[PDB]
Amino acid sequence: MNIFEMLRIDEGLRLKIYKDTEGYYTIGIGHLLTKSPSLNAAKSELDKAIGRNCNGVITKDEAEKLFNQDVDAAVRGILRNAKLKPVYDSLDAVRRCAAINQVFQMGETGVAGFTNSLRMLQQKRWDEAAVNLAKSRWYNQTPNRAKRVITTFRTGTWDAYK
Ligand SMILES: CCCc1ccccc1N
Ligand SMILES: [Cl-]
Ligand SMILES: [Cl-]
């Protein structure tokens, strides 16, 4: 297992514009297009990201390309963050995938305010961090996914992704 496979599992793959769990226009492998509710803004955003007139539809390769860029951006966002960086570097490889997942789904912002969890993870208090992480709107809105990420942080194995 690796980050791409993991995220492909959590986000799925859709080649036509769709609405995410929060009702926002998205495409491909969880690639957010816009928070606005105007489909047209969304199509404009898609065309600009792809570089051609898509008319709301993309190819598999195009999707995968956005996905590459997006995984990369996420990691790089983590590395640039002062609160995040030190934590991330303290983790092993599996757990780092779980960190990237979260940032991919919620932004560096969202994650940057999980202060108490940050600390617990840095101290390697797995079970404690796991409980703390579940006390969140993130877990409450997307429990199945949050469960898999939390298990991942908790155990350092790919079991939740089976
Ligand atoms: C709870 C925050 C977990 C975390 C630590 C380091 C980098 C990214 C993320 N998501
Ligand atoms: Cl792009
Ligand atoms: Cl879910």
Q: Residue 122 belongs to a domain with what CATH number?
A: 1.10.530.40
Cα–Cα distances (Å) from 107 to 47, 53, 104, 113, 162, in that order, read 23, 28, 6, 11, 26
Binding pocket residue ranges, ligand 1, CB within 6 Å: 78, 84, 87-88, 99, 102-103, 111, 114, 117-118, 121
Number of domains in the chain: 1
Q: Which domain holds residue 36?
A: 1-162
Phi (first) and psi of residue 156, to 5 degrees: 70, 20
Cα(56)–Cα(77) distance, integer angstroms: 28
Residue nearest atom 8 of ligand 1, based on CA coordinates: 99
Neighbours of ion ligand 3 (CB under 5 A): 142, 144-145
**CA 42 / ligand 2 centre spacing (Å):** 14
The DSSP secondary-structure symbol of 9 reads H
Give every strand in the sheet of 25-28, ordered side by side: 14-19, 25-28, 31-34
Experimental method: X-ray
Is 11 part of the annotated catalytic residue set? yes
